Design an enzyme around this catalytic site. Structure first.
Site, PDB file in Angstrom:
ATOM      1  N   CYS A  30      -8.493   2.583   2.844  1.00 43.99           N
ATOM      2  CA  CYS A  30      -9.108   3.646   3.632  1.00 43.99           C
ATOM      3  C   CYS A  30      -8.127   4.271   4.618  1.00 43.99           C
ATOM      4  CB  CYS A  30     -10.357   3.139   4.368  1.00 43.99           C
ATOM      5  SG  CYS A  30     -10.176   1.527   5.214  1.00 43.99           S
ATOM      6  N   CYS A  33      -9.887   3.900   8.766  1.00 41.17           N
ATOM      7  CA  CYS A  33      -9.589   2.586   9.321  1.00 41.17           C
ATOM      8  C   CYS A  33      -8.183   2.552   9.894  1.00 41.17           C
ATOM      9  CB  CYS A  33      -9.765   1.515   8.242  1.00 41.17           C
ATOM     10  SG  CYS A  33      -8.842   1.856   6.710  1.00 41.17           S
TER      11      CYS A  33
END
Length: 103
Positions: A30, A33
């Protein structure tokens, strides 16, 4: 720095405490994140009495499913295992919403 648990047990025993435990389900796949990762790094430096943790949801999948986590990262601060706040959608700034209001 923020700690990463290895078991749902580690998370469970933390969040079950009478203290503010904000754990964040993460992943290596991701982008959001990543950005909040240095941000929450700072914010986790500014929590003396509260504690910041961030887990790898690929290892902590079952626990993530317990807390019906469908976003990455997901920031949930727990209190006595009864929770204290819930934010779910990559929150570096909105963590402060839950984090400052509760912790």
């Amino acid at each position: 720095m923020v700690t990463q648990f290895k078991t749902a047990s580690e998370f469970d025993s933390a969040i079950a405490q009478d203290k503010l435990v904000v754990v964040a389900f993460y992943a290596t796949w991701c982008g959001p994140c990543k950005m909040i990762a240095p941000m929450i790094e700072k914010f986790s430096e500014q929590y003396p009495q509260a504690d910041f943790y961030k887990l790898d949801v690929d290892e902590l999948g079952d626990v993530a499913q317990k807390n019906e986590v469908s976003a990455m990262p997901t920031l949930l601060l727990f209190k006595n295992g009864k929770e204290v706040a819930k934010v779910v959608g990559a929150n570096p700034a909105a963590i402060k919403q839950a984090i400052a209001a509760n912790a």
